[PDB]
Design a protein around this ligand. Sequence first.
Ligand SMILES: [Cl-]
Ligand SMILES: [Cl-]
Ligand SMILES: [Cl-]
Lengths: 561, 560, 559
Amino acid sequence: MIRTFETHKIRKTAELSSALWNFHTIGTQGEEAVIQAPVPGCWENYPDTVSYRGQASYSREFEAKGNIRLEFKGVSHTASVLVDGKPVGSHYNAYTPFDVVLKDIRPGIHQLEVIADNSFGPDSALHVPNDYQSYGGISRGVVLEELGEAYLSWIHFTPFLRKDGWYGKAEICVRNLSSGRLDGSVEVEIGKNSFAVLPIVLEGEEEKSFSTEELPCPWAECWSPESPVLYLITAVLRTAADDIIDRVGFREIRTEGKDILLNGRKLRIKGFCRHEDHPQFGCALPFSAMQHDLMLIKDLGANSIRTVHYPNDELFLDLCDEQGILVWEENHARGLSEENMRNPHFKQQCGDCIREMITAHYNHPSIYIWGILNECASDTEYGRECYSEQYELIKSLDPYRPRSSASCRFKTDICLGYPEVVSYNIYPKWYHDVPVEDYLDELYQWIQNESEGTGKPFLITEIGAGAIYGYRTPAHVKWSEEYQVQALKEQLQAVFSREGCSGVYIWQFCDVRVCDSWFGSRPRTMNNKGIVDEYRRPKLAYEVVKDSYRSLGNYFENLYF
Amino acid sequence: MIRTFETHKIRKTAELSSALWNFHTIGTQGEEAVIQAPVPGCWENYPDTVSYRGQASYSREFEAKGNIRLEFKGVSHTASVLVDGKPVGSHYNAYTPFDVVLKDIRPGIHQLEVIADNSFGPDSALHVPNDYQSYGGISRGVVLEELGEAYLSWIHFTPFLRKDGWYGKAEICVRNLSSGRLDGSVEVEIGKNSFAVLPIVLEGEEEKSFSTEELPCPWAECWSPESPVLYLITAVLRTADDIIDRVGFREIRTEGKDILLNGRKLRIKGFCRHEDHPQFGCALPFSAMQHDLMLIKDLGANSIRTVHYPNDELFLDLCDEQGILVWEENHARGLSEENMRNPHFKQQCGDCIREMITAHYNHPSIYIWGILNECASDTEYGRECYSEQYELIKSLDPYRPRSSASCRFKTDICLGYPEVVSYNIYPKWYHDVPVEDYLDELYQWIQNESEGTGKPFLITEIGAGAIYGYRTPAHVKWSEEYQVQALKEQLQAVFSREGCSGVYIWQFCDVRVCDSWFGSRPRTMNNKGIVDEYRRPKLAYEVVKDSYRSLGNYFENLYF
Amino acid sequence: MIRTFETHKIRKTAELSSALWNFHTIGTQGEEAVIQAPVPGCWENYPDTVSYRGQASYSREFEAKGNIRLEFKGVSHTASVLVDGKPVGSHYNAYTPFDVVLKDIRPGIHQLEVIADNSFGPDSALHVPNDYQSYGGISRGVVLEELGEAYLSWIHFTPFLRKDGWYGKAEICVRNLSSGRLDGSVEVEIGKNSFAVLPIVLEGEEEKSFSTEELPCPWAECWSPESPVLYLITAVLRTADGAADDIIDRVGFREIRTEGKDILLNGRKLRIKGFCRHEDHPQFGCALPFSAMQHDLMLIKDLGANSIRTVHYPNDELFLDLCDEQGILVWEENHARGLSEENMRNPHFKQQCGDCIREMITAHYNHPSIYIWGILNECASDTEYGRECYSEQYELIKSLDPYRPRSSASCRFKTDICLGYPEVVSYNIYPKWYHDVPVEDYLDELYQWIQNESEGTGKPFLITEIGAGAIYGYRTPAHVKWSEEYQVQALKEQLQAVFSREGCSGVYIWQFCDVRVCDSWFGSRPRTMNNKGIVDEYRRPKLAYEVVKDSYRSLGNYF
Ligand SMILES: [Cl-]
Ligand SMILES: [Cl-]
Ligand SMILES: [Cl-]
C-alpha cells in the first residue's frame, strides 16, 4: 500500500515494497549475515541492528523492459540506487520522495540494490544528533513503473472561491524521454466531470508544464473538517498512452488580519505535534498504526496535526484528507544553530526538501500551511537570509497557501515580517516557572508592539510538559503524570483565552525516541512529552486535553461583531 | 531509640522522641490543622505537607525540675527551641546534634515547642537547592536530661599502636552550672578495666577538659572489619554524673600511597549513601538502616561514604558493630565560589565541623574526615576555605586522615592539603571516554603536576543512571542494561588502577532531589542507585556484587 | 521501643531487641554461616534467607542475677527459648506475647538463644499455607526484667458509664515467687488521682487475682475519636521492703455497647469507616517499626477512615498504643483465616485458638481503641463441628472480657448457623469482584436473609470485607479487571451500597495495602501478592485511593 487510492490505471506499475528484501550491513572486512528484512522498515527494529549507525544494503529482483521509473517514497536518510550493479541514482533526506528513470533496459530479470545510510557527519546538514531519531532503511514504499516514450510527471490542481462559486485551475508536467519532438494532448477530468484538454508539444528530452485556464466548477462541494469531500482528478496523455490520478478538495485557505480563514470561516486550531515514531516500526509506520494514532487524536478532540519536523508519508496525508484533519507540514529542520546552517550543504538540502515536498504534496486539501526551519537561528542575520530564501522558494512553488515557522527566539526573532502567520514554541510551567498567561501576554504584546509580525494571525506551535508514564507521586513533582495534568490544564486554558491567538499544537502526541547525545535532558533517551506514551497508552493528562479540546469547535463563532 | 547502647546509667534521661507530637505549619492568617506527627519524622512524608517548604511547629509536654539539658540529634534544617513559651536556643544545619541547657526550672509540666524551617535563602549557605532534598522536621531523636550542678559534656578516647601493643589516651570535658567553684574527680573505665582517675577543678560556670596520660592497654583486642571488637568506656564524675560511649582499638594512617588499617594496606569497596527513603525522608528508623546495611553487605562492600553530611549516630553505631568503614564529611555539595562567599558560609561550615567531630570522635568505623564535596577547589577563595577547614579538623582530631571529593579535573589547587587525594569521575555516563583512559589521564596529572603526588588516591564517586524498570535491547542510556555495562567497565578500571586504594560507587539507592534539578534528574530523582528508592535491586546489582565479592579488604599480593 | 509509654518505673527492665543478634539457620544440608541480624526482624528480609522456611537460631548475651522475667512480644511463629544452654520455655503463634520466668539464676553473663520456626505441618493448626505470609524470626520486641520476690503480672481496668458519671473497677494479678507467704498491698492511682488499695495475701508460690469494687471517677474525661483522652494507671506492690514492684498501663473512659441494630460509643450511634490492615511491608515483613506504623496510620487517616480491623491476628501493642492516642477504633481478632472443617479438627486447633485468645485479651484488655473482639475469620461456620468451636471460643472471650461485643467475619452466605452467638453480625462480600452481581442487590439479599431467616436478626451488622484487586500501574481504556480503573469503579459502587444499606453500621475495606501471600496461592494471586490494597505494598496510592477518600470524608463518625 502506497496511497489510499490508485494513482494509475493506464501506466503499468507494481509495488516493490510490502515485501522482504535481502539485507546486510556494510563497512567491514569479514562476512555479514544476510537476513530477510521488511520493506518498508527501519533496521533499528531488526534484532541485530537495534543500535546500528552506518551503511547497509537492501536488494531484491524485479522484472521489466524498456523505459522504467523506480519511485522511492523514503530512504532513511542517504540513498544510493544500483540497478544491475550500475549506480543510477542517489538521494538525501529521509522524508521526501525521489525517483530513478532508466531508458531502454534489456528485458528480463534485473537486480535492484539500495545502499541506505543513517550516518551523521559533514555531508548531512539536516539529519544531525537531535531531539528525534534518524533511522536507517527503506522506511516508505518503492514502486516500479514501466513507461513509454513520455509520461506525466505530476499534476497540480488549485481551487478558487469566487463570488459566484468554485473555480479551478490545473497544471500538468510532461516529460519526454524520446530524443525527438513529441506531440499529443492531455485530457483532464475531475470526479468524472469534463475539465480541459491541453495540447502538448515537447522537444526531444524536454520536461515542461502546461496550464489550463481558470474554469468554473459549479458541481463542486466544499472540503472542510465537517465535510471532507474529495474528488479524483485524472489526466490522460495521448500521443500518436499514459495517466496520472490524484485527489483534490475544494477549500480556500487565506489570512485576513489576525484571522486564519478556511472557506471564509475563522479557524480555531486544536492540534497535536506528531513525530513519525513508534517503538516497533521506527519511522516506518504501517497504515494500521497511522489510523490508530489518528483515532486517538480524534478521540482527544483535535482537528489538526503538525508534522514535526519533516514532511510526512503521503499515505498519512491521504488519511488526513479523508477525515478532515488540518495539517501544518514543514520542511526537514529542527533547532539548527547559525553555525549548523552554514554547513555548505544546508541551503541545497533545504531547497531540495522544499521542492520535493511541495511538488509531491501540492494537492492535499488537508495541508493548509507550509512551515520552515523549526527553531532555527531566526535571530541572526545569516539565519534571516536563509529564512528569506526558503520563504520565497515556497511562494514560487505555491503562491496561495500561507507560510510560517515555529520560532523559539523569544522577543529576538528578526524574521517575523516574512510569514503570513507568526508561530511560537513556548514551555511556561515546564522549562520556565512563570504563569502561562503572563508569559504568553508578554510575548504577544512584544509581537504586536515591537515586531513586523504585528497584526498577523498567531499560533502556539508547541506547548506541553514531560511525564514518564507510570511515575506518579502525591508530591506532583516534575516528570510525574500528576504534574503533567496540572501543566496542560493551565497551558490550554491560557492559549484558548489569548485574544488574537488562532490556537495551539500540543507538544506532543506520543513519546518519541531521540539521539543518544540528548540523554542528559531526556529520561529514557526519549522525549517524554507525549500525551500518550510510545506504546500509545494514555497518560493522566489525556483526560485533561480531551476535556479541553472537546469543549471547543473548529471555528470562532461568537467573536465581537 | 537514640544509640545502640545506653550512654547514661547515673544521669537521669528520658527520650522525648519516638512519640507523636502536635504539628502545624505556620505563616498564614487563618487556622491551620493541628495533626499528630511522628518524631523523628520529616513532614514531607505527612500527607498534607508532602510539598511544604517553610516553617512549622512541633510541640509536646515534659516533666522536669532543676537544671535540665534538651539534646536534639537533628532538626531539618533551621531550629528554634521554646520552653514554656520562652526562646532558649536555636540551630542551623539538619545533620548535626545540638543541645539547650536551662538552669533551675520550676518543677512540674513544661511546654516544649520546636519551630523547624526548611526554607532556602540568604540565611542558609549549606542547605540550598541541590541534588538532594532538604527536608523539614525533627528528623532525629530528642532527649531530656535532668542535671545536677555539673555534668560531663563529652569524652574522647584515642588508641595508639606502639611497638609493644595498644595504648590509650582519654580526654573528658566537664561543665559546671553553679556560680561557685567546683572540685571533684572523674573515674574512667574501658570494658570494666581500670583506666584512670582525674582530679577536677572548675571555676564558676566554667567548661574545661582534662586529659589522662598515654596508658598501656595490654588487654585490648583490635577493631577491624574481620573482627569489630568494641568496648564501653565509662566516665563517672564525683563531687553524681556519668557518660558512657564505645571505642574500638584500631589505627588509621597513611604511608606513601597506602591507607593503612592496623598496619595492613586497605582496599575500599564502598557505596555513597544518602539518608533518603521514600517513606521516611531522611528520618530512617533503625529497621530501615539495618536493611540498607544488609543489602550493602550482600553487595560485598566494606565501606560507606556519608554523602554529603554527617550521619545519625545510630547509623554509625551499626557500622561500628558490623565492621563497616566510614568516610564522613561535613555538610556541603557542589557550592560555587559565589555560594562559598555567602556571609554565613564559613561560620556554618565551622559549626558543622565542630559539632560533627566532637560528637563522633569515638566511632572506630570513621576512618577519614571529608570536607567540601565538589566545592570550588580550583579558586583562590576556595583554597582559603579548604585551608581553614582542614586546619580546624586537625585541631579537633589530629589523628585521622582528611580528604575532599574533588571534581576539579586537573584544575584543583588544594591537593597539597589533604592526606588522601579523592576524585569523583563519571566516564561512560557524563563523558564518553574509556574509563581506563580517563582515570589514567587524571592519575598521571595528579602524580606529575599536582601537590597531591605520592599520596593515597580514592575514587569517591563513579557510576551511572538507570530508571528501574526501563529496559531495552538497544541499551540506551537510562536503561538498566546500559547501567550494567557502565558499572562493569568502571569497576574493572578502578580496581586495576595502580596507586588507587578503591572506590565509592555513586550511589547505593535512588534519592529524591530538589525541583530545580528536574531537567537532568528523571522523576526529580537522582537515579544512579544500584537499588531504586524502594531498595529493589537493578540489573547492575549483580555486576557490583560479582566485582566486590571477588576482592578482599586488603592488598595482600602487592610487589615486594 | 516496646510501647509509646513507660510501663515500669520501679521494676528494673531493659530491652534486648532494638539490637543486632547472631543468626544462623539450622537443620539444613547447606552452610549455616552466622551473621548479625536485626531483632525485631523477619529473616525473609535478610538477603540470604529471603526464601527460607524452617528453623533458625537467634542469640545474644545478657547480664542479670536472681529472679528474672524474659518477655517476648512476638516470635514468628514457633519459639524455643534457651538460657545458658538449657531449654526454659516455648510458644506457638506469631502474634501474641509470652514470657519466661527464671528463679535465682547465677550472677553475671548469660547466653540467650531463641530457636524460631516458621515451618508448616501437622503441629501448626493456625499458621498454614494461606492468603498471607507466615514469616520467621523474632518479629516483635524482647524485654529483660530483674524481679524481686513477687511481681505484678497484669492489671485490667474497666470503666462504666452510670447515670451520675464515670465509674471504674480494677483487677490486678500478683505472682509470688517466694516459697514463703506474702503480705502487702497494691496501691492504684489513675492519672495521679487516688483510686484504691487492695490488701494482698499470697501463699508460697501463688499467683492470684484481686479486684476492687466499682468506684466513682468524677474527675474522668471520656475517650472518643474526637477527643482520645488517655490516663496512665499505675499499680504499686508494697511489701516489707517498700515499693517493691509496679505496673503502668493506659486506659480511656469510653463505653461500647450494642442496643438493637446500633453500635453505641458513649451513647452515640457509631459509623465504621474502616480498613482491613495486615502487618505486612516489603522491607519489614511483619516486623514494622514505629515509623512505618505511623506512616500507615497517617495514610489511613488521610483516607477518612476512623477504624482498623486486624486481619487476621492480634497486632503489636505499639500499633494499638498509636490507635489509642489517635482515637482510631480497632476490631481485633484471634489468629485464624479460612480454615476448613477438617483444618479445625487438627488435634492442636482448639488448644492453639484458646491460647491465642487468652494471651490476646489478657495483654490487650486496657486498650480503649479495641471496641470489639473477632474470632475465626471465614472459618467453617456452616458445619456442626465448626459451630462447636465458635461456641467454645465466644464463651472463652466472655469469661475474659464480659463487656466488649463479639463477632466473626463470615463468608458463609445464607448458610451460617452461628449468627445467634455474637453481638454483631459481620460478613465479607465481594460483589463486582468475585461475583458479577450489582452490589445493592447482593447486599440486600444477604441482609434480608439475616433479618428474616437467621438468629442474627435484629443485631448490629457490619461489612467486614469488601473490595477489588488492582495491580499498581496496570491501566487500560478497556477497564478490565486488575486495572486500576476497574478498581475505581468497583469501590465506588461498593461504598455507595454499604453506606446506603439500612441497618448496616459500616464497612472495613479489604484492604489497606497489597500483601505478600504463600506460594500455594499464586494461581489466583498475581505477583504472589493479594492485590486488593488501596495503596500498593510500597504504600503508593492507586487510582481508587481518591474514590475511597471522597466516600469516607463525606460521612461523620456518627449517625
Ligand atoms: Cl522530555
Ligand atoms: Cl540521575
Ligand atoms: Cl488479589
